[PDB]
Each structure stands twice: as C-alpha cells, then as structure tokens.
Amino acid sequence: ALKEITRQLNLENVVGDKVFGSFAENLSFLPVIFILDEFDLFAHHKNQTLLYNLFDISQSAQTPIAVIGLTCRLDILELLEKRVKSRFSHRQIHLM
DNA sequence: GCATGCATGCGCATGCATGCATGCAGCATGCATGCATGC
C-alpha cells in the first residue's frame, strides 16, 4: 500500500527507489482525496497502521485530506479499534 | 561487502476426538408358598 501510494503520487524520485522501510519522507511532507474500495479488508491488517495514520492526518491541521470508504458489511464500526473509531468522523451513507 | 527482507523449519498451546468404566433399572426365570382336591 505504501509503495502504491508513493508511486501514484510520483514522489518516488523525492522519497527514493530502494526498499527502505522509512516512510517519514512522505509523513513529514504530508489537497489529495483518497478512495478505498473494500474498506473492510484494511481493518484485518496487523495494527491498522495505515487507517490510523489516515485518520490522524485527517484530524491534523497540516493538509486537507478527504477519506471515502466503501463497505458491504453492516458491522464495519466494530471491526475498528477504539482509537481509530474515536478519531473516525461518524459520517455514514446507506445504499438500499 | 553488507544489509535487508523473505521463505522455511521448528516449538508450543489448544481444542477436539477417542477409549474406557460403572452404576442403574428393567426383565426374565426359577423357586417357595398357598390353594384345591380327593382318598
């Protein structure tokens, strides 16, 4: 996911080409909109690091970020940890 | 030449499947006892 984010933003020249795990190059540098298909799968990651960072930068006062998620499960609220749930703006749209 | 990240091998905990036994209740059977009945 980090590789795709870097490549789509065309910052690999700025960040670097090697496999180095440091991501503070983007994080320190970080209007861009995010679209997340199959949002439920991201909640099954080891620590939900990407979701937490996205919610943090959304709640931060550095740059404007809009987050849009798509889900088929009706229980997407309980699949999130307490911290991200608190930092998640409870904006839900239902398509029936 | 070195660092790094990935594939692999092994240990550990756990849940589940299997073996194993014992106590109870029902039933069938054989015996003890009561009854009839004649001589």
Curated annotation (Swiss-Prot):
It comes from the Eukaryota. GO terms for molecular function: ATP binding; ATP hydrolysis activity; DNA replication origin binding; nucleotide binding. It is found in: Nucleus. Keywords: ATP-binding, Disease variant, DNA replication, DNA-binding, Dwarfism, Methylation, Nucleotide-binding, Nucleus. One of its GO terms (biological process) is polar body extrusion after meiotic divisions. The keyword Lyase does not apply. GO terms for cellular component: chromosome, telomeric region; cytosol; nuclear origin of replication recognition complex; nucleolus; nucleoplasm; nucleus; origin recognition complex. Disulfide bonds: none annotated. It is linked to Meier-Gorlin syndrome 2: A syndrome characterized by bilateral microtia, aplasia/hypoplasia of the patellae, and severe intrauterine and postnatal growth retardation with short stature and poor weight gain. Additional clinical findings include anomalies of cranial sutures, microcephaly, apparently low-set and simple ears, microstomia, full lips, highly arched or cleft palate, micrognathia, genitourinary tract anomalies, and various skeletal anomalies. Component of the origin recognition complex (ORC) that binds origins of replication. DNA-binding is ATP-dependent. The specific DNA sequences that define origins of replication have not been identified yet. ORC is required to assemble the pre-replication complex necessary to initiate DNA replication. Binds histone H3 and H4 trimethylation marks H3K9me3, H3K27me3 and H4K20me3. Belongs to the ORC4 family. Component of ORC, a complex composed of at least 6 subunits: ORC1, ORC2, ORC3, ORC4, ORC5 and ORC6. ORC is regulated in a cell-cycle dependent manner. It is sequentially assembled at the exit from anaphase of mitosis and disassembled as cells enter S phase. Interacts with DBF4. Interacts with POLQ. This is Origin recognition complex subunit 4. It comes from Homo sapiens. The lineage of its organism: Eukaryota, Metazoa, Chordata, Craniata, Vertebrata. The gene is ORC4.
